[PDB]
Symmetry: C2
Subunit: 103 residues, 2 copies
């Protein structure tokens, strides 16, 4: 007998954000640095352009990553983690550990 996972469950709430096949990997790649869009895309080979920018939009909307605009020649977007997004890194540490030990 354990508490059920209704729409209030803290794990179920979290999986609304993190359920993507790319969400946590993007956060993993950004990490504690500033990364250009192009570097980010090359840091996750196989992710399509569409899957990257919908996911980048999603994460901005959730306040997990921040976007810096540079309207210069040539122009660029830079992404970094917010303090909220930084709170996801402990989850990712544990995922990395699982992978390295078991896969």
């Amino acid at each position: 007998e354990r508490k059920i996972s209704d729409e209030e469950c803290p794990v179920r709430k979290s999986m609304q954000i993190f359920a993507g096949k790319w969400t946590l990997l993007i956060i993993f790649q950004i990490n504690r640095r500033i990364i250009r869009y192009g570097e980010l895309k090359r840091a996750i080979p196989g992710i399509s352009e569409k899957m990257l920018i919908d996911e980048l939009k999603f994460l901005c909307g959730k306040g997990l990553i921040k976007k810096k605009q540079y309207p210069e020649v040539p122009p660029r977007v830079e992404y970094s983690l917010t303090p909220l997004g930084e709170k996801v890194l402990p989850i990712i540490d544990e995922i990395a550990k699982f992978g390295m030990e078991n896969l």
Copy 2:
């Protein structure tokens, strides 16, 4: 630093954990034994098809054990394998994120 290619431990893990339901199911089975029907009720809004495909996926990935009892009335029970129990520290961090920020 290190790119998320085929040799990336995070990328490898997300092949398994990407589901809407995967981590929720592991979380609900947890360190006990649970019948299909109890587990179905423990995650409201999951369809029969979703739960069955996911259970089969998790068995295939060696994360949960299925045990049939061909008796009257019949039952399937699920528990975590030792590999599955190693997913619980991930889920603890997710639960922590959920209650603190959501």
